[PDB]
């Protein structure tokens, strides 16, 4: 096995394939004019292809991922990196820098089980990026309900939808993708969502998604990502969206966010409850803590409904306002014993639900 490749042609591939010792190595394969690099953690896998325009010789080995990445990154910009197998070592040469790395046999590099694609679609990368970003923050972390440690991907009609919830707050985003789809849904593990997201530069290469019974695959240009799905049953987001919230408050996102952020300073550190009092075109936010410190914020907003009060966890609300990254926000209220739904005031494509607190 031998190849010589420009440093910069290896850097993006190496970042994508980087995260038993062999799981800490990358499989390198020279075949039919192409260098393929594979990383895996047994739950998921990334394969990056690099075209080889300089002389090369076929073969395959595995090499420590972090050391090989760090050597390539540490070489000077535009360096040519000559790689050859020599006995049990992998030699890396560029200028008068030489490195001998240990290897493990390509034969021992683990593969995901073979599987069949059942559902497939193509969409712009920017659309997948939007879907994931809109909701990623609401996924559970290492919860006993293992099926919340990931993101639902649901096809229906011509829409792809993502749902994330940690059992307390929920995020949902739907986008039309211009293809008739089966009604189907799957759960992608947390780490898979994150790796998928990192693969997307949002650029001009179409993203092709293939879904099997127990696997998902995403293909963009020179990169192919494969993950196991979470084998479990996800909650129905339709049941948590409030029935008929008829009290809509609209305000500038940044003004609302800064008012909540100040008030939060004097909220309970553990449960983070703040109270809202809504009246004719006015919002008052209050917060207090066990030491009886108090905050109050009054803002002009757009609101015409009945007067009401509601409490909620300000961290959950701030998470939403931070995810939204839009000029104006709509808070869709019902009463003091019901959830609130929050949206970009200009778009229904993403919706967030936060539960009421009694304070």
Ligand X SMILES: O=C(O)c1ccc(-c2ccc(F)cc2)cc1
Tokens standing for residue 249: 């408050």
Q: Among Ca ion, Cl ion, ligand X, none, what does residue 165 contact (CB within 5–8 Å per kind)?
A: ligand X
Helix, strand, or coil here: 9? helix
- The residue behind tokens 């595995």 is 62
Stretch binding ligand X (CB under 6 A), from 14-22, 166-174, 186-194, 296-304 = 166-174
Q: Does 149 bind Cl ion (CB under 5 A)?
A: no
- Cα dihedral sign, 174-178-182-188: negative
* Half-sphere exposure at residue 163, Cβ-oriented, CA atoms within 13 angstroms: 23
Instruction: List the one residue from 27, 30, 46, 170 that touches Ca ion (CB under 5 A).
Output: 46
Q: CB-wise, 20 or 265, nearer to a copy of itself?
A: 265
Q: Does 162 bind ligand X (CB under 6 A)?
A: no
Among residues 113, 101, 112, 115, the alpha carbon closest in space to that of 28 is found at: 101
Q: Among Cl ion, a copy of itself, Ca ion, none, what does residue 5 contact (CB within 5–8 Å per kind)?
A: Ca ion
Q: Determine if residue 147 is labeled as part of a ligand binding site.
A: yes
- How many Å separate Cα 158 from the centre of its chain? 22
Instruction: List the one residue from 28, 85, 151, 170 that touches ligand X (CB under 6 A).
Output: 170
> What character string, x for contact with a copy of itself (CB under 8 A) and - otherwise, covers 280-299?
-----------xxxxxxxxx
> What character string, x for contact with Cl ion (CB under 5 A) and - otherwise, covers 232-271?
----------------------------------------
How many whole angstroms separate alpha carbon 359 and alpha carbon 349?
A: 31
Q: Does 296 bind Ca ion (CB under 5 A)?
A: yes
Alpha carbon of 227 to those of 1, 9, 164, 200, 257: distances in Å? 29, 25, 18, 16, 36
Q: Does 172 bind ligand X (CB under 6 A)?
A: no
Q: Determine if residue 146 is labeled as part of a ligand binding site.
A: yes
Tokens standing for residue 34: 């192409």
Stretch binding ligand X (CB under 6 A), from 9-17, 81-89, 164-172, 330-338 = 164-172
Task: List strands edge to edge, sheet with 34-40.
Answer: 59-64, 25-31, 34-40, 44-51, 223-228, 215-220, 207-211, 119-123
The footprint of ligand X (CB under 6 A) covers 145, 165, 167-170, 235, 240, 339, 353-355
Q: Which residues are annotated as a binding site for DNA?
A: 66, 142, 146-147
């Amino acid at each position: 096995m031998k190849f010589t490749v420009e440093r910069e042609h290896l850097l993006k591939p190496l970042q994508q394939v980087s995260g038993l010792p062999i799981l800490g190595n990358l499989l390198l394969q020279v075949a039919d004019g192409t260098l393929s690099l594979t990383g895996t953690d047994l739950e998921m896998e990334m394969v990056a292809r690099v075209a080889l325009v300089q002389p090369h010789e076929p073969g395959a080995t595995t090499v420590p991922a972090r050391k090989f990445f760090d050597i390539c990154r540490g070489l000077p910009e535009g360096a040519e990196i000559a790689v050859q197998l020599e006995g049990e070592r992998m030699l890396v040469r560029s200028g008068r820098s030489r490195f001998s790395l240990s290897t493990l046999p390509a034969a021992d590099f683990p593969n995901l089980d073979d599987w069949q694609s059942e559902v497939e679609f193509t969409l712009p990368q920017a659309t997948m990026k939007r879907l994931i970003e809109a909701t990623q923050f609401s996924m559970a972390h290492q919860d006993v309900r293992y099926y919340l440690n990931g993101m639902l991907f649901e096809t229906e009609g011509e829409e792809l939808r993502t749902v994330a919830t940690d059992g307390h707050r929920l995020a949902v985003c739907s986008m039309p993708i211009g293809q008739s789809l089966p009604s189907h849904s799957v759960i992608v593990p947390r780490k898979g969502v994150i790796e998928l997201m990192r693969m997307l530069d949002g650029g001009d290469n179409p993203l092709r998604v293939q879904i099997g019974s127990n696997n998902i695959r995403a293909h963009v240009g020179d990169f192919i990502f494969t993950s196991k799905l979470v084998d479990g049953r996800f909650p129905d987001y339709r049941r948590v969206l409030p029935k008929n919230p008829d009290k809509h408050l609209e305000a500038g996102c940044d003004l609302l966010k800064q008012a909540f952020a100040r008030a939060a300073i004097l909220s309970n550190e553990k449960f983070r409850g703040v109270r809202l009092y809504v009246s004719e075109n006015q919002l008052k936010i209050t917060a207090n803590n066990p030491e009886q410190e108090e905050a109050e914020e009054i803002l002009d907003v757009t609101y015409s409904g009945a007067e009401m009060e509601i409490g909620f966890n300000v961290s959950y609300v701030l998470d939403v306002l931070n995810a939204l990254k839009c000029e104006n926000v709509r808070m869709m209220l019902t009463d003091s014993v019901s959830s609130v739904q929050i949206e970009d005031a200009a778009s229904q494509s993403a919706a967030y639900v936060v539960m009421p607190m009694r304070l």
